[PDB]
Amino acid sequence: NFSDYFTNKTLRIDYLFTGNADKQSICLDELSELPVWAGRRHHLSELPLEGNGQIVMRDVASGKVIYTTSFSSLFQEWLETDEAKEVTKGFENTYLLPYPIKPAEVEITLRNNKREVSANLKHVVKPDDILIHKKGLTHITPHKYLLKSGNEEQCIDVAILAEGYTTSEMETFYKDAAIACEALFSHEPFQSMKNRFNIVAVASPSADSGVSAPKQGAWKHTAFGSHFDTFYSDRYLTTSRVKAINDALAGIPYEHIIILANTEQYGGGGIYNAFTLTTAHHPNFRPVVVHEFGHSFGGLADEYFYDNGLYPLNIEPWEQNITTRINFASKWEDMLTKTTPVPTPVADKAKYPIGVYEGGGYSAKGIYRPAFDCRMRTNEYPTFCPVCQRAIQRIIEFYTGK
Amino acid sequence: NFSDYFTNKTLRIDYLFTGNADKQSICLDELSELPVWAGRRHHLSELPLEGNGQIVMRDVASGKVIYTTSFSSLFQEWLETDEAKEVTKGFENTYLLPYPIKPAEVEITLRNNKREVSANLKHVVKPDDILIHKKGLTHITPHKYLLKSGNEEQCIDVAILAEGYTTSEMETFYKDAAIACEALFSHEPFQSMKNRFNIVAVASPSADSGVSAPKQGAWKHTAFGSHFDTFYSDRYLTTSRVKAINDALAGIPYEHIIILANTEQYGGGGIYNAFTLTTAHHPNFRPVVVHEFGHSFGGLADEYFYDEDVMNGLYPLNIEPWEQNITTRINFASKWEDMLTKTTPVPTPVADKAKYPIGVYEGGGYSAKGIYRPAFDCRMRTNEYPTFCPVCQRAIQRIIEFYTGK
Ligand SMILES: [K+]
Ligand SMILES: [K+]
Ligand SMILES: [Zn+2]
Ligand SMILES: [Zn+2]
Ligand SMILES: [Zn+2]
Ligand SMILES: [Zn+2]
């Protein structure tokens, strides 16, 4: 099947998402070619999760769907901030597609939290277009495999990138990458699925040590320009230099990205099929990086809650570890016992390792999570809950087989 | 007074221009602070040329216009190509403004080739906003002054950047930069106005030697990702990495950018108040770099016309171009009518060329008919002719005087 439509290369597409809270738009930045296809070769027309946006590639001749994938984005977060009620802003976003033999139509769609299409772009890619930038042939960033279970066609390729490390302190970065990798494969189900993964540490250099702190007026020259005070939230570390992130990796096989920042301050986050970014020298580095990978690889939701609006109570979330009980049969109903009370009182929690516990996806009321505590709820707790474990296991099997 | 409203710093604003042939929009990308204001300190509310887009800065308190500038853009040329009927694309663009003391409203407007508004963005810049990225303090790209006629507040600052030169090739770059400076100041009016200019050469390194040649499938890792075949025109050498060009220059006072490409392949490009790009090692390096600076500094139009060219049709025949060296005879009184002798026929027959160094010659602006140029030949039409025509010279002189006074 795969070779009916694709060569063993990557069509990398860089998009800009732009707009404000009332109107959003997608445009094309650049088309690139990478030397191998590291993604999947089966289930090419299906998705593992809905995401908040989707890309669908169709063969122009037949109209068949030949590849699809889904994601979330930082842009869709910025859309909730107060700056989005005032000015129109733009964000870089990058997707890897298998490289087609014949012309292919690519359609990318963003959805809002009511699941309405908020932006859409359909465009034809001609595989012999001379303006497709060929990348990853020379000057490949120095890197080392931490775990090499197989070739990139059969294993899930995870790249760990360096932010705020100079060339002359990569020893520290490779140590931090190993710690992150060890933390990840001490959690089930990653632990028993360890031979499905390749982990490569990529020593992308920065001119300065550390990351930028705008509030202190301390701006640094780093590989990806990460900075605190994102959206004027003091503690929120991000980078928006997505083209620079992917250029650092060109020529190295990769499907998922973890970025490690050389700093002890708390900060970071993960976004489904975008990347994880986290600080490597904070005391909670080990549980936090795994929690972020739960978002960025697992597509899981946050299970903690306050006393909101992101998850409308009349829609079933696409994330697998929270429910509004609108279509609970598609979630973890089948993992409950025939008598588990719905909702599950915290008094009887010892009785119900899996239940339907009120509180999750930031709301105390109307959203429910699968267990009382979980890596997706708190750093102190030692494991993913059984529902998150099944969710992650299903992602792994979608890409590497039962 | 300038210091009524501005400090001696630069507010750099990066925008994204996005759209297709049907619809366009502007969004803000990033605000930056550079350590000195290298631009003008008088005529702050007037424009030397209309351009295809305008920026207007207003004090929020009083509504008063405190700075303005204009430009063209690669995006606005792209909009006239066939690709813009098939996809929506986005482009980086950077503008330097004086850094305000008190909050200011910035209005950026794009106009189409009928000189009507096609996109608009207004936004407020607060001078104490913490996400204004402070640049130009450390890691300043290595550089050498080739000409230093005065400080950056008195003179026009031109930066020449290196593209496709590795660290080991920078002696060659500095030699090429000196050839370009020499070529520039061998054309009038630059020659006589040389003491109004500072020229700095900036040794920005590339990992690979040479530049990308897409038609030949040979891509190169360079500082600014320049490439031939822009809009599928073989000789059109440009970059879309406008943030990277301006980042390389952070901390060096500049107003205009010339980029030298380490290549023998023929090509160049020039866009008003954005940048010039040129091949450094082709035999026509000297006339080309000056030709492209005619676009990027002078805002001049091309005076040539080819049958099979990507740019044909950029100028509608019922609109007077804003560029000073072509006319459609829609508002010729604003152009060079006041330099014609009273008996010059309009249009001027090519047979009578000997008799009229200045006339109204049919052919220019990428159209054989309906657009007219001021002289039979000019730097803006061919590489073999030696000088700018007299209308181009006056146009350039007026730009120099706008910035540095009569
Ligand atoms: K793989
Ligand atoms: K100046
Ligand atoms: Zn989280
Ligand atoms: Zn869980
Ligand atoms: Zn030209
Ligand atoms: Zn001329």
Residue numbers in the entry:
A (entry chain A): 21 to 327, 332 to 426
B (entry chain C): 21 to 426
From the paper:
Here, we investigate the substrate specificities of two enzymes of the M64 metallopeptidase family, the IgA protease ThomasA from Thomasclavelia ramosa and BF3526 from Bacteroides fragilis. In contrast, X-ray crystal structures of BF3526 in complex with substrate and product peptides, combined with enzymology assays, show that this enzyme targets the N-terminus of pre-digested proteins, but does not act on intact IgA. These findings reveal divergent substrate recognition strategies between M64 family members, while providing new structural insights into their conserved catalytic mechanism. Despite containing a metalloprotease domain with a putative zinc-binding motif, ThomasA shares little sequence homology with M26 proteases. This multidomain protein (~130 kDa) harbors a zinc-binding HEXXHXXXGXXD motif within its predicted catalytic domain, a hallmark of zinc-dependent metalloproteinases. Structural comparison of ThomasA323-878 and BF3526-STPP crystal structures revealed a conserved overall architecture of the M64 peptidase domain.
BF3526 crystallized in the triclinic space group P1 with eight molecules in the asymmetric unit (ASU) and diffracted to a maximum resolution of 1.9 Å. We could model the tetrapeptide substrate STPP in two molecules of the ASU (BF3526-STPP), and the dipeptide product PP in two others (BF3526-PP), while the peptide did not occupy the active site in the remaining four molecules (BF3526-unliganded). These findings suggest that the enzyme hydrolyzed the decapeptide, trapping the STPP peptide in the active site during crystallization, where it continued to undergo enzymatic cleavage. BF3526 comprises two domains from the N- to the C-terminus: N-terminal β-sandwich domain (NTD, residues 21–145) followed by a catalytic M64 peptidase domain (residues 163-426). The catalytic M64 peptidase domain shares a similar topology with ThomasA323-878 structure, featuring a six-stranded β-sheet (β8–β10–β9–β11–β13–β12, with β8 and β13 antiparallel) instead of seven, flanked by three α-helices (α2, α3, α4) and the loop 3. In the BF3526-PP, BF3526-STPP and BF3526-unliganded molecules, the catalytic Zn2+ ion is buried in the active site flanked by α4, β12, loop 3, loop 4 and NTD. Similar to ThomasA323-878 structure, a secondary Zn2+ binding site is located within the M64 peptidase domain, where it adopts tetragonal coordination with E323, C398 and C409 of loop 4 and C412 of α4. Notably, the scissile carbonyl oxygen of T1 also coordinates with the catalytic Zn2+ ion, which is further coordinated by H311 and H315 from α4, and D322 of loop 4 in a tetrahedral geometry. In both BF3526-PP and BF3526-STPP molecules, loop 3 shifts 2.9 Å toward the active site compared to the BF3526-unliganded molecules.
